[model samples]
Target: LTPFLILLRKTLEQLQEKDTGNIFSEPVPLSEVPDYLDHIKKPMDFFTMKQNLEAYRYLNFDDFEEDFNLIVSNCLKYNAKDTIFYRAAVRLREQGGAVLRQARRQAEKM
Candidate 1:
């Protein structure tokens, strides 16, 4: 789910005192990290990752995924909660979801 929506769900869960699942993965509220510590040891520095995301315009999907996956895997392994990384992932995920939604809308239009 989108972060905003996920947050609302979490808030509702909290207010209603409901257990969603095992609590090892708790949600962080904000969307952007400003430093390395903020990232909890994220491998790719924020600036470099931002540059790479932009460079995807010149990279093939395989190349971008290979690069992005390296950063993503490391972050996941460390349980890093860097806001910049989270924001970047959210944008990529939502962008894909939006494209799917657009396709669905077009299909419905037909």
Candidate 2:
């Protein structure tokens, strides 16, 4: 069994890796995407998700899962299928989904 929060951190670290990750590593820049805030109502990012650790807010695994999905959902809302942002979100979902499954199972054992 593993610590619940630790798994989130591990997932965050993996998701925030090199080129494919650095984009989502922090909040979307207002300067770059001027209308980003106008489009996505519930925006999220790696930093905010990880911030929950110190606040100790993610009591349930689904909470973490939901927030993680929102990151993708928010991106999908702002960036269309043609952009690399959309592509990365797809990859993040695929890669993150696997991690979620593993962690959920690991969390179940705990």
Candidate 3:
């Protein structure tokens, strides 16, 4: 479990680095995205995800993975296809997927 936790952190750092738009890295403030609350039922961001991890909100690897996917999906949902946010979400999902799977193999061995 500990090793997997470390691996999870690895993916987070990489994703945050790639979030050039600086949008998905944090929660969407109501001022910036007024309709965000209505559009996204369960909002997820890198910041909240880490906070949950630090507070032990996730019980297992799958729990953490769900939030990871949630953050990306939420971005895709709220942002239009022509926007940079949507493209960033797509890039992170693809790039993060590689590291996510790379991180998963360790848990299997454990």
Candidate 4:
């Protein structure tokens, strides 16, 4: 849990670094993100999956869903080739899992 806590903190930092929110952030929909975050390599990978999320004032729930599936598909197909980050990623994923849903809901009308 400690590792996850640190990773979660780092994920937020990464999101902030991008000046962009995470999957659950505004202009993006929760439905657009992967249902389960079993293998998020890094916070940047989330950004990579979202190619044009910044273009809209609000995220299209359907598009989010599509992108999520795509992201999940690739993750399922290939390992990230970054074992060193595996444990660290779990922390982030767990952290995101804990609060990301609420954040997305908050973004819906913000």
- Candidate 4 per-residue lDDT, tens place, 1-110, comes to 24333333443444434332232233223265554344444222455433344444124434443443343344433335464334333444445444545444544554
lDDT of candidate 4 at residue 88, scale 0 to 100: 35
TM-score of 4: 0.36
- Among all candidates shown, the one with the greatest TM-score: 3
* Local distance difference test, candidate 2: 0.79
The regions of model 1 sitting more than 4 angstroms off are: 1-42, 53-58, 80-110
Give me candidate 1's TM-score against the actual structure.
Answer: 0.27
Q: What is the descending TM-score order?
A: 3, 2, 4, 1
Over 4 Å off, model 3: none
Relative to the true structure, how large is the alpha-carbon lDDT of every model? Answer: 0.38, 0.79, 0.80, 0.40
Residues 1-110, model 3: lDDT tens digits: 47666766776787677677777777878797788888899998889988987787865677887888888898899889999888988998887787778766766686
Q: What is the lDDT of residue 16 in candidate 3?
A: 78
lDDT of 1 by residue, 17-103 (tens): 221221212322235433435545434422343455444432223443343344444445444466554444544444434443443
Candidate 1 vs candidate 3: which has greater TM-score?
3
| lDDT value for model 1 | 0.38
Specify the poorest-scoring 10-residue window by lDDT in model 1.
15-24
Candidate 3 clash figure, as a count: 0
Residue 102 shift from truth in candidate 2, angstroms: 0.3
